[PDB]
């Protein structure tokens, strides 16, 4: 079983810590990004998500509520057991910016990947 | 203030119900999709997310843990007050499939939009 | 129907003109966006793409090489013929911004949708 | 450097060959994917794209018109020259599947990334 509980680093140098996974697959955590729109403002930020409970390589999603920006990032992906029996999260993300008017919604969503491994 | 609490329908005919938003911006809810990979299997499914607390048009994210599939969808977007003072969620989503091997990860992530309004 | 040749408008109010589609489904065109990072700078920009040639509701893609910034957008989608014979392009796009250092690559790609129908009226 | 002309391999083991880039930054090429929805069907497929012409680390896009399915992929990204002069394409893609009814459009677009470097060895 691959599970999300524990400390992770992604390929950008960001680190996150994910707490215990409950009976419904729910979890909370913290995220410290290495990169940002304004790197001088980066603070620790909370995350909340759900993983599938029974699968050995479960898919999951989480939302990061950035404490230094009006932006939100969502991550979704799959917790894999790699060739060496080590856990790897392959994720894709959407980074949503706050726009002042619905008419500028088109500009507001960045997309990307991240690979996480244990710290 | 636009907030997520309440009942919503999206442009595909899906409906969701979002509970009270807590002091940290956290919320839970339910989702009944009108469309699916296998429509004959569609069951009510739970969601969990975070919205920014203080903004009048906050950004948010949520994860839907599908009860009839190993897939997960994440939604992120912004809660807008439209020209008539009505609430509209403009969202983008990533639909993550479960793949059996890390080598097939490339195939696993669909992307799309949804507009939600009150039921 | 669903030859991309012609004039099209999207939901944001951008216009595009696509030329003849050749035997290989290849086409060029021009694009006038209604929105941009720096909207004061907007100028007509060229596109190049390919559609599937024999499909009645073909998928397709094209690239817009913006002439007023260092960005590039690609669109991909499908031309549908609706229950009234009306052509509708449903597209998704990626808008790539130029960054200088590979370590900033993560920041550089936006995603979105557009719906296009043929320009309704002539000048 | 960062003329797209040449042979490239991505992280999935696909290969592509891009021809001369013209004065407008336009190029054609061929693509042999290492992976597919139906991998038994894979055949060489044409591409067409545009890169920014004067930028040293240009952004670009291209469309692949798959010859063995009704799908289309677009790639967009940026050619970087790393601290050793090595060229690296960092791309994101959208892969559009054909559906029959507009009401199924929501299901039809996948998203992903690829990293390309020039083919290292000749046959
Ligand atoms: O700058 C912001 O607007 C908030 C922080 C965003 C950090 C992003 S989330 C996706 C990517 N992966 C990371 O590890 N950090 C960046
Ligand atoms: O079929 C599945 O794999 C699970 C259900 C996915 C339903 C998707 S989520 C994005 C889109 N918006 C909706 O309202 N439903 C579909
Ligand atoms: O801002 C730029 O540098 C180039 C213009 C980008 C315009 C984008 S492309 C996707 C979206 N759809 C449009 O019609 N215009 C915007
Ligand atoms: O499956 C198909 O019908 C067409 C082939 C799709 C291959 C995709 S395109 C994006 C990804 N990168 C590759 O090198 N190949 C896959």
Residue numbers in the entry:
A (entry chain B), B (entry chain B): 3 to 121
C (entry chain A), D (entry chain A): 3 to 125
From the paper:
Common to all members of the avidin protein family is their high affinity towards a small ligand, D-biotin. Despite their relatively low amino acid sequence identity, all avidins share a highly similar tertiary structure, an eight-stranded β-sheet barrel structure, where the biotin-binding site is located at the open end of the barrel. With the exception of rhizavidin, shwanavidin and bradavidin II, all of the structurally characterized natural avidins are stable homotetramers with four biotin-binding sites, one on each monomer. We have previously created functional chimeric avidins using DNA shuffled sequences of AVD and avidin related protein 2 (AVR2).
Here, we present the crystal structure of the previously characterized chimeric mutant A/A2-1, which proves that the avidin fold is robust and suitable for extensive genetic manipulation. In addition, size exclusion chromatography indicated an oligomeric state smaller than a tetramer. Therefore, in order to better understand the structural origin of the physicochemical properties, the structure of mutant A/A2-1 was solved in complex with biotin at 1.8 Å resolution. Two monomers were found in the asymmetric unit and, as expected based on the high sequence identity to its parental proteins AVD and AVR2, the quaternary structure was homotetrameric, each monomer having an eight-stranded β-sheet barrel structure with the biotin-binding site located at the open end of the barrel. The sequence and structural differences to AVD are in the region derived from AVR2, starting at A38 of the L3,4-loop of A/A2-1 and ending with S58 of the L4,5-loop, whereas A/A2-1 differs from AVR2 at the N- and C-terminal regions originating from AVD. As observed in the crystal structure, D12 of A/A2-1 hydrogen bonds with the ureido oxygen of biotin in low pH conditions. A/A2-1 was crystallized at acidic conditions (pH near 4), and hence the X-ray structure of A/A2-1 represents a snapshot of conditions near the pKa of D12, where about 50% of the D12 residues in the crystal would be expected, if exposed to solvent, to be protonated. In the A/A2-1 structure the OD2 oxygen atom of D12 is surrounded by aromatic and nonpolar residues that would act to reduce the effective dielectric constant (in comparison to bulk water), effectively raising the pKa value and increasing the probability of a protonated D12. This would support the formation of a stable hydrogen bond at pH 4, thus explaining the hydrogen bond observed in the crystal structure. In the L3,4-loop of AVR2, AVR4 and A/A2-1, there is a proline residue, which introduces rigidity, and the loop is further stabilized by the intermonomeric salt bridge between D39 and R112 for A/A2-1 and reported earlier for AVR2 and AVR4.
